[PDB]
Design a protein around this ligand. Sequence first.
Ligand SMILES: *[C@H](O)[C@H](C[C@@H]1CCNC1=O)NC(=O)[C@H](CC1CCCCC1)NC(=O)[C@@H](NC(=O)OCC(F)(F)F)[C@@H](C)OC(C)(C)C
Ligand SMILES: *[C@H](O)[C@H](C[C@@H]1CCNC1=O)NC(=O)[C@H](CC1CCCCC1)NC(=O)[C@@H](NC(=O)OCC(F)(F)F)[C@@H](C)OC(C)(C)C
Lengths: 306, 306
Amino acid sequence: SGFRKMAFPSGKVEGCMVQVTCGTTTLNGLWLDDVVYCPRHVICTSEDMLNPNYEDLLIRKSNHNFLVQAGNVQLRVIGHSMQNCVLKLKVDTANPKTPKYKFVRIQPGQTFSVLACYNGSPSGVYQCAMRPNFTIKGSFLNGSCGSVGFNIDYDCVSFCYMHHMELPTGVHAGTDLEGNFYGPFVDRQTAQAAGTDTTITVNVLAWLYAAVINGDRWFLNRFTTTLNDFNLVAMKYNYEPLTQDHVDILGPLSAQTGIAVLDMCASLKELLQNGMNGRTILGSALLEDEFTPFDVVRQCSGVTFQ
Amino acid sequence: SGFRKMAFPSGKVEGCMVQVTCGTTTLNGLWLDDVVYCPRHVICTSEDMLNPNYEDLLIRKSNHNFLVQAGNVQLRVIGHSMQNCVLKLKVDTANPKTPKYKFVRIQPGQTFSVLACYNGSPSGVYQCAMRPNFTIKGSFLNGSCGSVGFNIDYDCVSFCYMHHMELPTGVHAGTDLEGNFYGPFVDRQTAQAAGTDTTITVNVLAWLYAAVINGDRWFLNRFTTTLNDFNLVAMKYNYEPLTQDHVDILGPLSAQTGIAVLDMCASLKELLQNGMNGRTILGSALLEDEFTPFDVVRQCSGVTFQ
Ligand SMILES: *[C@H](O)[C@H](C[C@@H]1CCNC1=O)NC(=O)[C@H](CC1CCCCC1)NC(=O)[C@@H](NC(=O)OCC(F)(F)F)[C@@H](C)OC(C)(C)C
Ligand SMILES: *[C@H](O)[C@H](C[C@@H]1CCNC1=O)NC(=O)[C@H](CC1CCCCC1)NC(=O)[C@@H](NC(=O)OCC(F)(F)F)[C@@H](C)OC(C)(C)C
């Protein structure tokens, strides 16, 4: 028993982190096969940031402008290309520690692990969710750019995030590994703001199911509610609508606990309406929303990865 | 910015996990050099658990009773010895992925990462603290025994925990890597209970300093308080006494934020006295106590590990 915000083992991603240096900019890159992926603003300088034209900026660079440090070993760039907001630096050495891997663009509400890195050297690992507004509430300092987010499925690393920037509110924005920003953000230092975030309702429900599997039962009730009637109470409290597809995903957690999904929704309703009144759920005093249904099943049942 | 409950990168420990099987018991072991460490109750069976004599139980086993699975490779046990509550199975293969490593017995209040494992295969990584009552609020299912807790210091893995058992309250007990239980617990299925836990005050203070570094300032005040007067308010709310040694550890966090340690104690006092009144600190509605002063400095400043 117990329930922890749990990251995937990070050893497969640690083996891919490298330091990429160009001019006065140093950040992390991801080394898979003979290619290093990193944010394209690595080619910017201190006066390139206000409104850059990265095509113009990139035709001006040569391969020997890119210093790619892998441990105490310099990699040699032999070519470069830009796809959307990321550089691909082709290097002469294929990474022998290349895991099996995919690039995936995740939907909001989905979670992943972030291996935070500085100077190509992994510092820490934590769990995150894509917020409905396509930010992530990360922990990033300067030099953490090019750090990646990821899920692991059996033996395969699905890369889903690469870090570019902190917004003035202190949340973080970034791209998928093919370089497309999550959300409306560009990689240009301008006025930009997150957009009103909302709470991932389907995840809160999955976490309440986690609690029930782990002995917390005080918040349940006998009431039920229709899906329409739940979303009327949802939108007041700035929760996302629950779709019928959300209900079906929550099927196995309903089946294993014997609590119909619509009954857990009646629980959440009263929780939002009456507060928690000095009680806690899974050691938390707030309704947590960064566990997906995947996660709860993974952690409450025991799925590993080789 | 941001502040996350952050584990160390786990790749160095992942490379040491193995599956140890003996009779009907399968758990994880730790493979460093030519030795596999695992909990000694691996030699118990389903009727060996009520009150065992592990010396008697162990003189009865031969090396070929221990199946040591490392990936899809059987290791051969060539000898075995018991130190306190852990077996050391000597094997013919030295682990080539052996990190640099130490065994340390940590004080309560200290934190570490747990790489949760099943069948020798890492499943997840999370952060933990040794609770003042020598339990850990872990996330462990059946088969997670022999999973280890650890800190990383530069390039060296300080192993500090190995998992043995869940208590009826659902918290977890275990040994250091030299096999000495944390706390009064034995490895014998008996009536056993945790003992009244308390809140790690020095850690709560370090976390409030984290908040201040990250822009949360609402809980501060102009008041100060003496150390004695703080501990009078502490012991009511089941907090641990703050020692002068706790104050000095919190020095750099005092110096970097400009908030004298005794002034942050006056803040905590009013927080315990007046609640948080619907506000949150670092996205939390409870006073968090599983960041040490180390951690806050590590995460708010950027220390990595090669
Ligand atoms: C990468 O190492 C670095 C990490 C940042 C720094 C602090 N935590 C992080 O996540 N990334 C940057 O510093 C990034 C540079 C890059 C330059 C070309 C355009 C794309 C970004 N800049 C930022 O993260 C700044 N944010 C910002 O003002 O961008 C504009 C927008 F849209 F508002 F986000 C950071 C450094 O913000 C301030 C407020 C200046 C601290
Ligand atoms: C190792 O894989 C396994 C992990 C446990 C199971 C569920 N989560 C865990 O942390 N360890 C055990 O199951 C362990 C066996 C071992 C046998 C010889 C004596 C030392 C323990 N037993 C337990 O963790 C049980 N706890 C227990 O009752 O021990 C006595 C004490 F002191 F009360 F803790 C678990 C399985 O407890 C119950 C309540 C039966 C679920």
